[PDB]
Amino acid sequence: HGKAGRKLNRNSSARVALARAQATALLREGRIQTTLTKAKELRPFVEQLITTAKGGDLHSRRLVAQDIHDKDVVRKVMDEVAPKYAERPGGYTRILRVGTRRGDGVTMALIEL
Amino acid sequence: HPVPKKKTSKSKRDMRRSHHALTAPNLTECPQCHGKKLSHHICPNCGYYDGRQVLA
Amino acid sequence: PRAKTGIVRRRRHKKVLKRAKGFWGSRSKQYRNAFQTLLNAATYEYRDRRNKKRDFRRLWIQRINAGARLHGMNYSTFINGLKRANIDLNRKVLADIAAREPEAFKALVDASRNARQ
Amino acid sequence: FRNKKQRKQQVKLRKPGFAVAKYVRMSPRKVRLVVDVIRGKSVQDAEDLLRFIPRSASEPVAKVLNSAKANALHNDEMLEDRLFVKEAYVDAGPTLKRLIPRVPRARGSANIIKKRTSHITIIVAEKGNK
Amino acid sequence: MKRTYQPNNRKRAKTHGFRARMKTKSGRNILARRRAKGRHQLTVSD
RNA sequence: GGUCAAGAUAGUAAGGGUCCACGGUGGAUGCCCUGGCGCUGGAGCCGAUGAAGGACGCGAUUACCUGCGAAAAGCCCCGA
RNA sequence: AAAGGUGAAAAGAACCCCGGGAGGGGAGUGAAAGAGAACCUGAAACCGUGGACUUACAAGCAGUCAUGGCACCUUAUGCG
RNA sequence: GCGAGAGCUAACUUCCGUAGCCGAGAGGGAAACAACCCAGACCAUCAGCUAAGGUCCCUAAAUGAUCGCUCAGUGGUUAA
RNA sequence: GUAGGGGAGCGUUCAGUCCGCGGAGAAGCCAUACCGGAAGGAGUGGUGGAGCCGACUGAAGUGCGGAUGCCGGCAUGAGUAACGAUAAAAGAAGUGAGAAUCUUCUUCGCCGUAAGGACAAGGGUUCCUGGGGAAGGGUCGUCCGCCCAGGGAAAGUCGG
Ligand SMILES: [Mg+2]
Ligand SMILES: [Mg+2]
Ligand SMILES: [Mg+2]
Ligand SMILES: [Mg+2]
Ligand SMILES: [Mg+2]
Ligand SMILES: [Mg+2]
Ligand SMILES: [Mg+2]
Ligand SMILES: [Mg+2]
Ligand SMILES: [Mg+2]
Ligand SMILES: [Mg+2]
Ligand SMILES: [Mg+2]
């Protein structure tokens, strides 16, 4: 009867390379559309990461550099994206649900910054 | 290897299928584009969900 | 020359089938099962036909002794006193006479009493 | 009246509110399930529930619900605000067969069924009682 | 695993061949019999 | 006729059953002949002037059959 | 191996409508489209849709008999 | 069931003799129950008498009559 | 009343003869509460679109529930088990009637004495180009090794 933090859809390694990859893309696009699930999971993972970028030191930048493998996305989050949320108590990310799909019939959604 | 013993009847099978009735979506009129869409979701027609979101 | 079974089997089977009405499921629908049902149906028909007369025998008795017991006799006593009078070959269906007609069966009870003691 | 021969030429015999989709590769049993909620309701409502109902079967049932209303309006001069599904139903159809497999008892148990249409239909009509 | 049938052009031909089937007369028997049996064609075209 | 009490009693069908009505599926049955079957009779061998049976070709358009044959779905003479 | 059937005649359905289509609905032709090319009849299994009377304390070869209830009246107001 | 042999004076045993039934026998009785008890079904009936069996309620029919016996639920598990 | 013997008959096809019926509708098919001692046979209704009852005699490939019988069709299991290797995907962009599945971009993971490359044998246009979307594709499909058309293969020296 598990009472636990994480959900995985898949294996131990992939849960990461995914949450990393989708976080990278949200930061790059500013909103993306994915399954309601992957969205729901991605939400706090990306938020804790905006906070790593807030605070602005090289330490922080190099921490963010661990889940963000593209220098331009990390530069954006660090110099552009982080600061802009300043007076923000934390948690700008939000979940909008678009609707169902054809092939698999799976309800999808927008995660937006 | 554990096979069924008899053809199940027309009445028994139609009885088992008793529960398979689809539950029709409860819809609602969109306050903005006034076309029927669904709760806690974006109106596919106008794109408006509390103000406006998707490019329609 | 060759005579196929055409148009023969079908009429036959429909004839069989048609007896079947409130017949449940394949009994009323598939041939072989229907016809087969109509074998045991034969048994119960004829035999319970001879039986129905036993059944009504039972009913009428069950009524007559009831009226009797109501008036102080019983079937043994009532029919005894009845026969004891060469008078009543009444016998058959006397039940309804007891059911519908109170004072009549009172007179038959009293009378059959006279024919006893 | 006259005789049957004459009854045939005196009347063309129309079909009000009727249209049918033959031979849609789908399962009757399946399509039935969609079609059931549609049945007997306001034709607009019908188009909406049909919009949002997640079975893929729902689509060719939608494509038809219109085509029958379409016939109902244009061909039968009907009044669309009084329109509703009077009836609809799913009748099976000619189960699809390919060239193969043909072989007795050799790796022989498999489907190759690809079941028949269900035929769709939906007769449309006007409210009456209101 | 490895099947019964390992297709070979110079085999399917060196036996079964019209030439081959004509080499002996039990063969040519097979030939003309096959002919009268309807047109059942001999391996060079098969 | 209003609230207590004690009684009895209907109806609702998620789904099922029987009958009826109307479709669908299927292709039996009736009708039919473009195909067979054996009786009787007729006729009865072809091939080194290349058989039987085929291969590949021929056509404005040609994939199957038919018909032919680098003179190729044909060529010349006579008869109708 | 299975193998057949519009129609007397292609008159084989312009044109309109729903649809990418398939498919259908009109129009028109036709004696008939209750023949429309999944084109003679179209049985039975089998799948549905609508109606009638019914069924959610009852042990069951599915019937048979007997009485009551409800419904229907074209060999047919009862003999149903 | 009767008269024997085998057998253990066992067996829903086995082998003969003898009646009767089942076999090929429905109907009533013995809860159920081929053979046992009563009785052999041509057809119809919502008519009557009885057989074996029965007559408290589940089912038809004396919770009958007189004289007793048993106090064990014997009745409704065998003996020394 | 079982094997078995005997008697009367019912129905189906063909055949000869007789009476006939049919486009104001034949056979067949569908419903039915009537007739007959039974096999059965009528009446009216509904379909159907060419043929067909009845009587008398004759001849049979002449009467099906079973044969794990034959062919065909359609059920049950049931919307069940499965969708063919636990080398993962993700977002943007495009097209389109419709895209989780096609296209492009950016990443991610997998093989790398292979899961790269070149031949043989075998297969036979599967290659390329342009179209297509019924079936084939274990879902989808705008896509393909699928369907349509058109192109493409060049040797004194390579192999014969
Ligand atoms: Mg948990
Ligand atoms: Mg790892
Ligand atoms: Mg971390
Ligand atoms: Mg319901
Ligand atoms: Mg037809
Ligand atoms: Mg014995
Ligand atoms: Mg015997
Ligand atoms: Mg038999
Ligand atoms: Mg199961
Ligand atoms: Mg399961
Ligand atoms: Mg597919």
Short mmCIF file of all heavy atoms in Angstrom, two decimals, chain I residues 134-145:
data_model
loop_
_atom_site.label_atom_id
_atom_site.label_comp_id
_atom_site.label_asym_id
_atom_site.label_seq_id
_atom_site.Cartn_x
_atom_site.Cartn_y
_atom_site.Cartn_z
P A I 134 -10.14 4.52 -48.40
OP1 A I 134 -10.85 5.58 -49.16
OP2 A I 134 -10.02 4.73 -46.92
"O5'" A I 134 -10.85 3.15 -48.80
"C5'" A I 134 -10.90 2.05 -47.91
"C4'" A I 134 -11.24 0.78 -48.65
"O4'" A I 134 -10.83 0.92 -50.03
"C3'" A I 134 -10.54 -0.47 -48.17
"O3'" A I 134 -11.18 -1.05 -47.06
"C2'" A I 134 -10.54 -1.36 -49.41
"O2'" A I 134 -11.79 -2.02 -49.58
"C1'" A I 134 -10.38 -0.32 -50.52
N9 A I 134 -8.99 -0.16 -50.94
C8 A I 134 -8.22 0.95 -50.78
N7 A I 134 -7.02 0.80 -51.28
C5 A I 134 -7.01 -0.49 -51.80
C6 A I 134 -6.04 -1.25 -52.46
N6 A I 134 -4.80 -0.82 -52.73
N1 A I 134 -6.38 -2.49 -52.85
C2 A I 134 -7.61 -2.93 -52.57
N3 A I 134 -8.62 -2.32 -51.96
C4 A I 134 -8.24 -1.08 -51.60
P A I 135 -10.35 -1.26 -45.71
OP1 A I 135 -11.37 -1.60 -44.67
OP2 A I 135 -9.43 -0.12 -45.53
"O5'" A I 135 -9.42 -2.52 -46.03
"C5'" A I 135 -9.97 -3.82 -46.06
"C4'" A I 135 -9.24 -4.72 -47.01
"O4'" A I 135 -9.06 -4.06 -48.29
"C3'" A I 135 -7.83 -5.08 -46.63
"O3'" A I 135 -7.73 -5.99 -45.56
"C2'" A I 135 -7.25 -5.53 -47.96
"O2'" A I 135 -7.79 -6.78 -48.38
"C1'" A I 135 -7.82 -4.46 -48.86
N9 A I 135 -6.92 -3.31 -48.88
C8 A I 135 -7.10 -2.09 -48.30
N7 A I 135 -6.07 -1.30 -48.49
C5 A I 135 -5.17 -2.06 -49.23
C6 A I 135 -3.90 -1.79 -49.75
N6 A I 135 -3.28 -0.63 -49.60
N1 A I 135 -3.27 -2.77 -50.43
C2 A I 135 -3.91 -3.94 -50.58
N3 A I 135 -5.11 -4.32 -50.14
C4 A I 135 -5.69 -3.31 -49.46
P G I 136 -6.75 -5.63 -44.34
OP1 G I 136 -7.56 -5.69 -43.09
OP2 G I 136 -6.02 -4.39 -44.67
"O5'" G I 136 -5.65 -6.78 -44.40
"C5'" G I 136 -5.44 -7.48 -45.62
"C4'" G I 136 -3.99 -7.43 -46.02
"O4'" G I 136 -3.78 -6.52 -47.12
"C3'" G I 136 -3.03 -6.94 -44.97
"O3'" G I 136 -2.80 -7.90 -43.96
"C2'" G I 136 -1.82 -6.59 -45.82
"O2'" G I 136 -1.15 -7.76 -46.26
"C1'" G I 136 -2.48 -5.96 -47.03
N9 G I 136 -2.60 -4.51 -46.83
C8 G I 136 -3.73 -3.84 -46.46
N7 G I 136 -3.53 -2.56 -46.32
C5 G I 136 -2.20 -2.40 -46.60
C6 G I 136 -1.43 -1.24 -46.60
O6 G I 136 -1.84 -0.11 -46.37
N1 G I 136 -0.11 -1.46 -46.92
C2 G I 136 0.41 -2.68 -47.22
N2 G I 136 1.73 -2.69 -47.49
N3 G I 136 -0.30 -3.80 -47.23
C4 G I 136 -1.59 -3.58 -46.91
P G I 137 -2.62 -7.46 -42.42
OP1 G I 137 -1.78 -8.54 -41.88
OP2 G I 137 -3.91 -7.17 -41.74
"O5'" G I 137 -1.62 -6.22 -42.52
"C5'" G I 137 -0.27 -6.41 -42.96
"C4'" G I 137 0.63 -5.27 -42.53
"O4'" G I 137 0.32 -4.05 -43.26
"C3'" G I 137 0.55 -4.90 -41.04
"O3'" G I 137 1.85 -4.54 -40.56
"C2'" G I 137 -0.33 -3.66 -41.07
"O2'" G I 137 -0.21 -2.82 -39.94
"C1'" G I 137 0.17 -3.00 -42.34
N9 G I 137 -0.71 -1.96 -42.84
C8 G I 137 -2.09 -1.88 -42.81
N7 G I 137 -2.54 -0.72 -43.26
C5 G I 137 -1.37 -0.01 -43.56
C6 G I 137 -1.19 1.29 -44.06
O6 G I 137 -2.05 2.09 -44.37
N1 G I 137 0.15 1.61 -44.22
C2 G I 137 1.19 0.78 -43.92
N2 G I 137 2.42 1.27 -44.12
N3 G I 137 1.04 -0.43 -43.44
C4 G I 137 -0.25 -0.75 -43.29
P G I 138 2.58 -5.45 -39.46
OP1 G I 138 3.50 -4.58 -38.72
OP2 G I 138 3.12 -6.62 -40.15
"O5'" G I 138 1.42 -5.93 -38.49
"C5'" G I 138 0.87 -5.06 -37.50
"C4'" G I 138 -0.54 -5.46 -37.22
"O4'" G I 138 -0.55 -6.77 -36.60
"C3'" G I 138 -1.38 -4.55 -36.32
"O3'" G I 138 -2.69 -4.53 -36.86
"C2'" G I 138 -1.47 -5.33 -35.01
"O2'" G I 138 -2.65 -5.08 -34.28
"C1'" G I 138 -1.46 -6.76 -35.52
N9 G I 138 -1.04 -7.80 -34.57
C8 G I 138 0.26 -8.09 -34.25
N7 G I 138 0.36 -9.08 -33.40
C5 G I 138 -0.96 -9.49 -33.18
C6 G I 138 -1.45 -10.55 -32.34
O6 G I 138 -0.79 -11.35 -31.62
N1 G I 138 -2.85 -10.61 -32.41
C2 G I 138 -3.64 -9.77 -33.17
N2 G I 138 -4.96 -10.01 -33.08
N3 G I 138 -3.19 -8.79 -33.95
C4 G I 138 -1.84 -8.71 -33.91
P U I 139 -3.41 -3.15 -37.22
OP1 U I 139 -4.82 -3.50 -37.52
OP2 U I 139 -2.62 -2.44 -38.27
"O5'" U I 139 -3.44 -2.37 -35.84
"C5'" U I 139 -4.53 -2.51 -34.94
"C4'" U I 139 -4.91 -1.18 -34.37
"O4'" U I 139 -3.90 -0.75 -33.43
"C3'" U I 139 -5.00 -0.04 -35.39
"O3'" U I 139 -6.27 0.03 -36.03
"C2'" U I 139 -4.67 1.19 -34.55
"O2'" U I 139 -5.82 1.59 -33.82
"C1'" U I 139 -3.63 0.63 -33.57
N1 U I 139 -2.24 0.80 -34.06
C2 U I 139 -1.56 2.02 -33.98
O2 U I 139 -2.04 3.04 -33.52
N3 U I 139 -0.28 2.02 -34.48
C4 U I 139 0.39 0.94 -35.03
O4 U I 139 1.54 1.06 -35.45
C5 U I 139 -0.35 -0.27 -35.09
C6 U I 139 -1.59 -0.29 -34.61
P C I 140 -6.45 0.48 -37.58
OP1 C I 140 -7.92 0.46 -37.77
OP2 C I 140 -5.59 -0.26 -38.55
"O5'" C I 140 -5.97 2.00 -37.60
"C5'" C I 140 -6.57 3.00 -36.78
"C4'" C I 140 -5.77 4.29 -36.82
"O4'" C I 140 -4.49 4.09 -36.17
"C3'" C I 140 -5.42 4.82 -38.21
"O3'" C I 140 -6.44 5.65 -38.74
"C2'" C I 140 -4.14 5.60 -37.99
"O2'" C I 140 -4.45 6.91 -37.56
"C1'" C I 140 -3.49 4.84 -36.83
N1 C I 140 -2.39 3.93 -37.24
C2 C I 140 -1.17 4.52 -37.48
O2 C I 140 -1.10 5.74 -37.35
N3 C I 140 -0.09 3.80 -37.83
C4 C I 140 -0.20 2.49 -37.96
N4 C I 140 0.90 1.83 -38.32
C5 C I 140 -1.44 1.84 -37.72
C6 C I 140 -2.50 2.59 -37.36
P G I 141 -6.87 5.54 -40.28
OP1 G I 141 -8.14 6.29 -40.48
OP2 G I 141 -6.81 4.09 -40.64
"O5'" G I 141 -5.66 6.20 -41.09
"C5'" G I 141 -5.23 7.54 -40.86
"C4'" G I 141 -3.83 7.74 -41.39
"O4'" G I 141 -2.91 6.93 -40.64
"C3'" G I 141 -3.62 7.32 -42.83
"O3'" G I 141 -3.91 8.39 -43.70
"C2'" G I 141 -2.16 6.90 -42.89
"O2'" G I 141 -1.32 8.01 -43.15
"C1'" G I 141 -1.89 6.43 -41.47
N9 G I 141 -1.87 4.97 -41.30
C8 G I 141 -2.98 4.21 -41.04
N7 G I 141 -2.70 2.94 -40.88
C5 G I 141 -1.31 2.88 -41.03
C6 G I 141 -0.45 1.76 -40.96
O6 G I 141 -0.76 0.60 -40.74
N1 G I 141 0.88 2.12 -41.16
C2 G I 141 1.31 3.40 -41.40
N2 G I 141 2.64 3.55 -41.57
N3 G I 141 0.51 4.46 -41.47
C4 G I 141 -0.78 4.13 -41.28
P U I 142 -4.51 8.10 -45.15
OP1 U I 142 -5.98 8.28 -45.08
OP2 U I 142 -3.87 6.85 -45.63
"O5'" U I 142 -3.95 9.27 -46.06
"C5'" U I 142 -2.74 9.10 -46.79
"C4'" U I 142 -1.99 10.39 -46.86
"O4'" U I 142 -2.65 11.34 -45.99
"C3'" U I 142 -0.54 10.32 -46.40
"O3'" U I 142 0.24 11.18 -47.23
"C2'" U I 142 -0.60 10.89 -44.99
"O2'" U I 142 0.60 11.51 -44.58
"C1'" U I 142 -1.71 11.91 -45.12
N1 U I 142 -2.38 12.23 -43.85
C2 U I 142 -2.38 13.55 -43.46
O2 U I 142 -1.87 14.43 -44.12
N3 U I 142 -3.01 13.84 -42.29
C4 U I 142 -3.64 12.95 -41.45
O4 U I 142 -4.16 13.36 -40.41
C5 U I 142 -3.58 11.60 -41.93
C6 U I 142 -2.97 11.28 -43.08
P C I 143 1.25 10.53 -48.30
OP1 C I 143 2.22 11.57 -48.77
OP2 C I 143 0.38 9.85 -49.30
"O5'" C I 143 2.03 9.41 -47.47
"C5'" C I 143 2.95 9.76 -46.44
"C4'" C I 143 3.56 8.55 -45.77
"O4'" C I 143 2.63 7.99 -44.82
"C3'" C I 143 3.91 7.41 -46.70
"O3'" C I 143 5.21 7.57 -47.24
"C2'" C I 143 3.79 6.18 -45.82
"O2'" C I 143 4.98 5.97 -45.10
"C1'" C I 143 2.69 6.59 -44.84
N1 C I 143 1.36 6.06 -45.25
C2 C I 143 0.99 4.74 -44.94
O2 C I 143 1.78 4.01 -44.33
N3 C I 143 -0.23 4.29 -45.32
C4 C I 143 -1.06 5.10 -45.98
N4 C I 143 -2.25 4.65 -46.36
C5 C I 143 -0.71 6.43 -46.31
C6 C I 143 0.49 6.87 -45.93
P C I 144 5.61 6.89 -48.64
OP1 C I 144 7.00 7.26 -48.98
OP2 C I 144 4.55 7.10 -49.64
"O5'" C I 144 5.73 5.36 -48.29
"C5'" C I 144 6.81 4.93 -47.49
"C4'" C I 144 6.79 3.45 -47.34
"O4'" C I 144 5.65 3.06 -46.57
"C3'" C I 144 6.65 2.70 -48.65
"O3'" C I 144 7.92 2.54 -49.24
"C2'" C I 144 6.00 1.38 -48.22
"O2'" C I 144 6.99 0.44 -47.83
"C1'" C I 144 5.21 1.79 -46.97
N1 C I 144 3.74 1.85 -47.14
C2 C I 144 2.98 0.68 -46.95
O2 C I 144 3.53 -0.41 -46.67
N3 C I 144 1.63 0.75 -47.08
C4 C I 144 1.06 1.91 -47.38
N4 C I 144 -0.26 1.92 -47.50
C5 C I 144 1.80 3.11 -47.57
C6 C I 144 3.13 3.03 -47.43
P G I 145 8.11 1.83 -50.66
OP1 G I 145 9.42 2.29 -51.23
OP2 G I 145 6.86 2.04 -51.41
"O5'" G I 145 8.13 0.26 -50.31
"C5'" G I 145 8.75 -0.69 -51.17
"C4'" G I 145 8.27 -2.13 -51.00
"O4'" G I 145 9.22 -2.90 -50.21
"C3'" G I 145 6.90 -2.34 -50.34
"O3'" G I 145 6.26 -3.47 -50.94
"C2'" G I 145 7.29 -2.71 -48.91
"O2'" G I 145 6.28 -3.42 -48.23
"C1'" G I 145 8.54 -3.56 -49.17
N9 G I 145 9.46 -3.74 -48.04
C8 G I 145 10.08 -4.94 -47.73
N7 G I 145 10.87 -4.90 -46.70
C5 G I 145 10.78 -3.58 -46.29
C6 G I 145 11.44 -2.93 -45.21
O6 G I 145 12.24 -3.38 -44.38
N1 G I 145 11.09 -1.59 -45.12
C2 G I 145 10.23 -0.95 -45.97
N2 G I 145 10.05 0.35 -45.70
N3 G I 145 9.61 -1.54 -46.99
C4 G I 145 9.93 -2.85 -47.10
#
